[PDB]
Design a protein around this ligand. Structure first.
Ligand SMILES: OC[C@H]1O[C@H](O[C@H]2[C@@H](O)[C@H](O)[C@@H](CO)O[C@@H]2O)[C@@H](O)[C@@H](O)[C@@H]1O
Ligand SMILES: OC[C@H]1NC[C@@H](O)[C@@H](O[C@H]2O[C@H](CO)[C@@H](O)[C@H](O)[C@H]2O)[C@@H]1O
Length: 348
């Protein structure tokens, strides 16, 4: 009873797409295309970020440098950072890449997590031609391949998946997978799981979707307050009330800030400034105050979107002057997370 234990109802969104030239053949994701402006006309030549030491695809700079997500020693350090933050579940981005380098990374992550008693669940992304049939096939593959790993997450005996952009699939399709009567149901099978869909817009649209698709719960993802109805924290009390009334699990997503203008220069309206951690505090406070049973954190290391709690350091190159953690130390967002985990556990 030290107040330092991992919390297993706290989920931190984790990305394993970073590479080094040495380990992966390229500085993967540190190099990144610059997205054209959706409202910016037809002849755009936006360019790319080369992913050199001076110029990486983030408005911030990692304390660990241009790391490889395949590097066992980087993984060990990340797991130690999870321990520091008291975040007991790593929610791994999963893009269905069906290649051996990804299979290797997933094994390394599970192994490194287990050494620190961290758990892993999968964040199922909108991969090409994703539909309920191949989703089932991939759920089967993941549970079969990893269900016996000691680090594989379970809640009251069930695996848990977050489904990004779930709303892109019709409720009549979801019901085949998620209804107890569905033609390809996972309910009452070896592959049953808590399915947590992405709540985006207004209750008028989202309430029937969640009910008719038979999702077990919902999350909101976006670190930038106000980006969607779901990511507007003043809605969370109301959202929790509905969740409780309808037997659903609400897992609001909290983040320390947002900025993606290195890769999306036209997207400045979505910037949310960290102000020495006050933004993080405000958002985490709203989640706890809503009376939820679980909280998700956006993100551990989505460096592109500037939502990361992973330690960042001050850096000025000839190419760019990076943002940093201002008056706070590089590990401030890890220790502040630990602080909020404590408060969460206090009132659970
Ligand atoms: O405009 C860039 C925007 O893209 C991403 O969000 C998109 C999508 O995933 C979401 O489902 C909807 C919800 O309204 O919005 C976009 O279409 C995110 O990367 C976001 O942070 C970013 O601003
Ligand atoms: O994990 C859910 C959701 N979060 C924000 C992004 O990480 C998004 O993925 C895409 O955008 C990133 C850059 O922010 C890009 O590098 C990646 O290729 C896209 O998939 C993700 O689905």
């Amino acid at each position: 009873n030290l107040g330092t234990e991992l919390d297993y109802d706290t989920f931190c969104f984790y990305y394993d797409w970073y590479g080094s030239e040495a380990i992966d053949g390229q500085y993967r994701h540190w190099a990144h295309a610059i997205a054209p402006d959706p409202n910016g006309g037809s002849g755009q030549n936006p360019g790319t970020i080369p992913g050199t030491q001076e110029s990486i695809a983030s408005n911030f700079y990692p304390q660990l440098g241009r790391y490889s997500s395949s590097d066992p020693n980087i993984l060990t350090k990340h797991m130690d950072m999870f321990v520091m933050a008291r975040t007991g579940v790593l929610a791994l981005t999963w893009w269905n890449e069906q290649d051996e380098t990804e299979a290797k990374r997933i094994g390394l992550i599970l192994d490194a997590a287990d050494k620190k008693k961290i758990k892993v669940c999968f964040h199922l992304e909108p991969y090409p031609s994703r539909n309920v049939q191949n989703l089932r096939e991939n759920i089967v593959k993941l549970i079969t391949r990893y269900g016996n790993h000691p680090a594989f997450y379970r809640k009251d005996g069930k695996p848990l998946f977050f489904i990004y952009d779930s709303y892109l699939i019709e409720p009549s399709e979801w019901e085949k997978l998620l209804s107890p009567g569905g033609s390809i149901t996972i309910r009452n099978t070896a592959y049953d799981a808590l399915m947590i869909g992405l709540w985006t817009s207004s209750p008028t649209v989202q309430r029937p979707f969640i009910l008719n698709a038979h999702f077990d719960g919902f999350y909101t993802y976006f670190a930038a307050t106000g980006f969607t109805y779901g990511s507007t924290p003043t809605n969370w009390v109301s959202m929790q009330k509905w969740a409780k009334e309808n037997g659903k699990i609400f897992i609001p997503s909290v983040g320390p800030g947002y900025i993606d203008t290195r890769i999306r220069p036209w997207n400045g309206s979505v910037i949310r400034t960290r102000t020495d951690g006050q933004y993080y505090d405000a958002m985490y406070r709203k989640a706890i105050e809503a009376g939820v049973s679980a909280i998700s954190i956006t993100s551990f290391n989505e460096w592109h979107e500037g939502s990361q709690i992973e330690p960042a350091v001050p850096y000025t190159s000839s190419e760019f002057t990076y943002l940093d953690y201002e008056n706070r130390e590089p590990d401030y967002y890890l220790t502040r997370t630990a602080y909020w985990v404590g408060k969460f556990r206090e009132s659970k």
